């Protein structure tokens, strides 16, 4: 007896295993950003799905609703902090419309690549 540790999984496998379009897009992302796994892309899609679910649950509400204001401003702030969302886009619809690449461009790997220092994402 002791309080259990909480745990969650951070990725979701897609329903259709063999879809050539999705496979091509996934491998293009992996080659552009230096990844060893489709699990990384699945993880980013999982995070983005959670964010989008939250934004939909808020947008169904009324504006000036305190829950909407609080949680939406918090989400927007938390994304603007990591730069996944520009300070031009702070209306909670661009949140829904973001991308996977917007998250994937903020990884320290590609950020190193941008800030010199590596001249390749694998390096």
């Amino acid at each position: 007896p002791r309080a259990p540790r909480t745990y969650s999984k951070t990725y979701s496998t897609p329903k259709r295993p063999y879809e050539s379009s999705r496979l091509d897009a996934e491998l293009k992302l992996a080659g552009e950003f230096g990844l060893k796994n489709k699990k990384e892309i699945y993880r980013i899609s999982f995070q983005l799905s959670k964010i989008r679910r939250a934004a939909r649950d808020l947008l169904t509400r009324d504006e000036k609703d305190p829950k909407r204001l609080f949680e939406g401003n918090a989400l927007i702030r938390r994304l603007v902090r990591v730069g996944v969302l520009s300070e031009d886009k702070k209306k909670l619809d661009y949140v829904l419309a973001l991308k996977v690449e917007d998250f994937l461009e903020r990884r320290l790997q590609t950020q190193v690549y941008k800030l010199g220092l590596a001249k390749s994402v694998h390096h």
Partner: protein, 258 residues
């Protein structure tokens, strides 16, 4: 089963103690005392978790066993003495005096006070009865029996006790316009100046309350504790003064001062 329970598992302790769900399988079970178990700070938690004057239970026992700390003027060399609302905890070393009093979030606050204010506490009378030989007595929320009171002291009133003798110095009656402290429920910690009460002969008197910001709410009379008139209270109030800022305003202030 078969008798009283002597253990208390974590995740069954009250949440307002703020005990880590980790850091053990058990929690301190408050000993039998003047306060209910679900309403009790006890001293181990007060000294280790809130004040950080100790890092273990061994150190708390060490502190208590050299008689530095006293509750309501008495020493209480017990690790699980249930200290509760309005209890006065005096540490002659450090020359400190605390009054157990709720913050607005629903937890107990580290409310330091002066020695002249630690010479008294407030008590909510629960029943006025006739004892043996015709002696009337009042019972408070801390199990204090006080004989020969003023005949006008009725139930749901508040009483000023001198804490050296167990004598009464003054009393506040329950009436509209009186300042209340909420002790129990969702509105726990608020302070809001009664406007009127609702009777319901048969069960559970209710009472309406309105904060300084004119925010109204409703509670049961068992969760209410008059502490003076509007304006002047009879005690020192903690920071916030029972206003219950919304989460938005809370973050606004936390950003105003950062």
């Amino acid at each position: 089963a078969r008798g009283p329970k002597k253990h208390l598992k974590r995740l069954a302790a009250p949440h307002h103690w703020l005990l880590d769900k980790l850091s053990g399988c058990y929690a301190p079970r408050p000993s039998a005392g003047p306060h209910k178990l679900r309403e009790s700070l006890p001293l181990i938690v007060f000294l280790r978790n809130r004040l950080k004057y100790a890092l273990n239970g061994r150190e708390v026992k060490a502190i208590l066993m050299q008689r530095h700390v006293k509750v309501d003027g008495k020493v209480r060399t017990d690790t699980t003495y249930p200290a509760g609302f309005m209890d006065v905890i005096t540490l002659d070393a450090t020359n400190e005096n605390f009054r157990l009093v709720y913050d607005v979030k629903g937890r107990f606050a580290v409310h330091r006070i002066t020695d002249e204010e630690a010479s008294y506490k407030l008590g909510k009378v629960k029943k006025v009865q006739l004892g043996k030989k015709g002696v009337p007595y009042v019972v408070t929320h801390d199990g204090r029996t006080i004989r020969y009171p003023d005949p006008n002291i009725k139930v749901n009133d508040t009483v000023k006790i001198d804490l050296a003798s167990g004598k009464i110095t003054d009393f506040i009656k329950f009436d509209a316009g009186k300042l209340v402290y909420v002790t129990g429920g969702r509105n726990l910690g608020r302070i809001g100046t009664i406007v009127h009460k609702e009777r319901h002969d048969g069960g559970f008197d209710l009472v309406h309350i309105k904060d300084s910001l004119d925010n109204t709410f409703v509670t049961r009379l068992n969760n209410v504790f008059v502490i003076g008139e509007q304006g002047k209270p009879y005690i020192s109030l903690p920071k916030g003064k029972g206003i219950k800022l919304s989460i938005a305003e809370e973050r606004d202030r936390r950003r105003a001062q950062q």
